[model samples]
Target: MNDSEFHRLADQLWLTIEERLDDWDGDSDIDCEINGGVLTITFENGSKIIINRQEPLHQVWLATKQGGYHFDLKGDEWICDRSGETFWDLLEQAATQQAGETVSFR
Candidate 1:
């Protein structure tokens, strides 16, 4: 994909993640903050899930309690380089663990 496409998809995911956090039904306090191409999700336990776009590499990066990951767009999905994890799956797994609640980034 082109650079603009990369930015578009990554930005969309950031928006989706923010929306999911806003719609969280559990008792845990969740906060989503967005600035430019970065979206940071803060859980009640004081942990964070940071999502950002790396413009030069044409990839999106995710940071969580689990670790840091870099995802490049491949076909129809954002795939992690190290773990072969999809963006949605990684986000769901990381956020669920960090928040101690079920999270679905669908």
Candidate 2:
């Protein structure tokens, strides 16, 4: 995808993530902010997960306490090339781990 295309897709994905987090009913509060193509999700415990668009690479980059992951569109789902995990799954997993409770984005 071109730069504009990547931005559109990535923006849509970021908005979706933000909406899901907004609806999260977990005990602790989660804050989400989007700025300059970067989405920062901050947990109540002060841990964070950063998701950003990699324009040159046409990929979405995720950073968590565990490590960093890069994802690209694959069959309607953004998938991590290294782990073959879907974007939502990894986000839920990472968020759950950091939040100390089960988290779902579905």
Candidate 3:
């Protein structure tokens, strides 16, 4: 996709993630923030999972307690370069572990 296209998709993805996390109603406190094409999710345990758009590479980058990952858009879904997992799956997995609670974006 072109730069504009990537920006649009990335912004939408961040919005979706923010909405999902904001709707979370678990016992654990979670905060979601998006700024300058970067999304930061902070868990109650003081850990963070950072997701940001790699504009030049046209990819999405994620950093969590697990590790750092880069995702390339494939047919509308962002697939991990190393794990071959979808963005939502990875985010759910990371958030669940980081938050010490079950987190789902289903």
Candidate 4:
């Protein structure tokens, strides 16, 4: 996908996360920024979610404090390290976990 498409997808994904995992601290905020072909989502508590789209390699990487998974687009589907789960699942889980945390971004 092009940069615009990527941003659009990322924004939608972010909103989905926020909606699915409500109750983040009042001071908490999630940031989605794209730079140098990397889309990084940083939470208020210092954790981050990163996606690096390599067009030449035709791969996208999903990363967080837990681990990193690489994915390749196949016929509109993203094939990644985990099975039966999409990238959206990863983001949703991360957001949910963040909502339960008390630590501040350091």
Best candidate (score: TM-score): 3
Mind giving the per-residue lDDT tens digits that candidate 4 earns over 1-106? Answer: 5666655654564454444335344556766676775677778678888777655555567887788777655555566756645666665566557644443321
List all candidate RMSDs to the true structure: 1.4, 1.3, 1.1, 6.4
Per-residue lDDT tens digits of candidate 2, residues 1-106?
7788787888789779888888877797889888775889998889999998888899999999899999998888899989999988998899999999899856
lDDT of 1 by residue, 3-73 (tens): 88986887777767777778888878889888775788898889999888888898889999989999988
Residue 48 of candidate 1: its Cα lDDT? 93
- Give the clash count for each candidate: 0, 0, 0, 0
TM-score of each model, paired residue for residue: 0.90, 0.91, 0.93, 0.60
Instruction: Identify the runs in model 4 with alpha carbons over 4 angstroms from their true place.
Output: 1-27, 82-84, 99-106
Best by lDDT: 3
Tens digits of per-residue lDDT, candidate 3, 1-106, equal: 8999898888888888888988999999999887775789998889999998888999999999889999999988999988789989988989999988899867
Which pairs of residues collide in model 4?
none
TM-score winner between candidates 2 and 3? 3
> Pairing residues by index, what is the TM-score of model 1?
0.90
> Residue 84 lDDT in model 3?
89
